[PDB]
Design a binder for this molecule. Structure first.
Ligand SMILES: CC(C)(C)[C@H](NC(=O)C(F)(F)F)C(=O)N1C[C@H]2[C@@H]([C@H]1C(=O)N[C@H](C=N)C[C@@H]1CCNC1=O)C2(C)C
Lengths: 301, 299
């Protein structure tokens, strides 16, 4: 069917991973120029992790409280000379700028958008994969203990956009983290207390993209003349666990290429949601919302 | 359970662009050798059935050009060309300073490897595939992707196992092992070629059922068992591969209590239909996760 889960080559980001340690707590960090980023629950002792006091934990610290090492590529003479708190992240200043710092930005990711994740353990990259920010502001990653501070990113021209630093696993196999302004996706708390997510929805625009990808690979039995307006679809969606459909130029390109209108697919989504009646789309019997329109454009062209 | 692949920095440092006349594609730069698919020598017109022996003869001392775009750029000087099955070994006068420790393996069907997709010698994407029972992969490759490289990483050693060569009649792909021989014996020539029928990788379906049981979804576990011998006889007539168990599958059986043979019987049932229910959110047998996947990701 042509659609694999593709990630950005991780070499750029691999060169920026470090191990942050704070006493005997240790996790992963991002070394960009003279700054190391890592989640702030590294100051916390396991005992006090159930209801900690980060401002208290912070004034407790000085530069000497933190140690940063680099285990990958050229070794790791790193002296912390500054430290600040920023939302749920620590902002350490180190005395050596990273020579491997890529061109980069900090931007928050919206639901339905896809990014690449570099899973790291003790400052060592181990695996990469790709996730879609869910409507309930979680991601379904593969994160084992020691993975906090793993980094999520997308790439533009030469510009890496860092968008996600791992922090937590909720009661399902479900993860959340921070943007690089310190805020947490979905407003979860970096405290080991029971926290429930909101119910998830389908990303409508991605389901439309996948449907276009089927029409592009000669699977179009679900296409009829009938149409549902966008405004009509978004009303129906509020009551059916579906996100507002918001069009883009990527979607529009697929509409022109296949010659099938958005409104035709919004209608089909409404019929396929009640069940495929035992037929198959691209090898599947359920709606798929993990491929963005940009992905279909890249892979199917 | 996510489709997860090896971080690619090491392999990115070995990708280069090989150029021959008016043809260009990717190559791999190890020590003093650049590997790449031999049809770089074939003019676009004459791919229909080429004479690779003649083409290598017609090569001169500057018929090949190799550029490194990633990292510190460089023009590498070719100082010798050899063929080996469906690959060229070009010798260059500079050794890749970023050559990692590597080996040249050949994936058996069912095995998963990481792919680094390149265009014009620049990496653009990485994904993971399982070598299919019919020796194709379901990749995402466009034109210019030839010479893209598949690998696994045992410890700190990179196991190079695939160099990409062609797209078959469906959206399916195949390429060379690094001994120059093409998975599935497809030919590097532009002709219609028949792939054999695919099959489910029995041991991966077994792995996936274990990942279900590990995650609470154990409804399909009845006390009935089918023996490996029995199942294998059944597989020959139900599009399944011969089951060959491993120490990795045994880990899943020990940390679970369910025997390999119970799940072999379950597969004979689930093949007929899920009877309404679902396993890990699915209504079909999943066979793209290996026992090592389930071990690593549900430790
Ligand atoms: C798809 C096409 C009809 C063009 C053809 N297929 C068959 O000829 C078949 F029918 F035999 F398979 C085919 O792939 N090629 C024709 C010619 C080389 C190869 C080729 O251009 N390969 C590129 C990788 N080296 C990548 C391709 C580009 C499209 N997507 C890919 O992955 C050789 C087989 C020697």
């Amino acid at each position: 069917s042509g659609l694999v889960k593709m990630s950005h080559p991780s070499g750029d980001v691999e060169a920026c991973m470090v191990q942050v340690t704070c006493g005997s707590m240790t996790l992963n960090g991002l070394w960009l120029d003279n700054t190391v980023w890592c989640p702030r629950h590294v100051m916390c002792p396991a005992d006090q992790l159930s209801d900690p006091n980060y401002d208290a934990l912070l004034i407790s610290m000085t530069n000497h409280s933190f140690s940063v090492q680099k285990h990958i590529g050229a070794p790791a003479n790193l002296r912390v000379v500054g430290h600040a708190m920023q939302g749920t992240l620590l902002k350490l200043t180190v005395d050596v700028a990273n020579p491997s710092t890529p061109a980069y930005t900090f931007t928050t990711v919206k639901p339905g958008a896809a990014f690449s994740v570099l899973a790291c353990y003790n400052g060592r990259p181990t695996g990469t994969f790709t996730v879609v920010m869910r409507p309930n502001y979680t991601i379904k990653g593969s994160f084992l203990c020691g993975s906090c501070g793993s980094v999520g990113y997308t790439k533009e021209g030469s510009v890496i956009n860092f968008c996600y630093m791992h922090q937590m696993e909720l009661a399902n196999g479900t993860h959340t983290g921070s943007a690089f302004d310190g805020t947490m996706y979905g407003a979860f708390m970096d405290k080991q207390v029971h926290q429930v997510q909101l119910t998830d929805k389908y990303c409508s625009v991605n389901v439309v993209a996948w449907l276009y990808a089927a029409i592009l690979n000669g699977c179009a039995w679900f296409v009829k003349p009938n149409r549902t307006s966008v405004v009509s679809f978004n009303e129906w969606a509020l009551a059916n666990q579906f996100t507002e459909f918001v069009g883009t130029q990527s979607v529009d390109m697929l509409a022109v290429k296949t010659g099938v209108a958005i409104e035709q697919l919004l209608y089909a989504i409404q019929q396929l949601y009640t069940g495929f009646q035992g037929k198959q789309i691209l090898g599947s019997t359920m709606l798929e919302d993990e491929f963005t329109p940009e992905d279909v454009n890249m892979q199917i062209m």
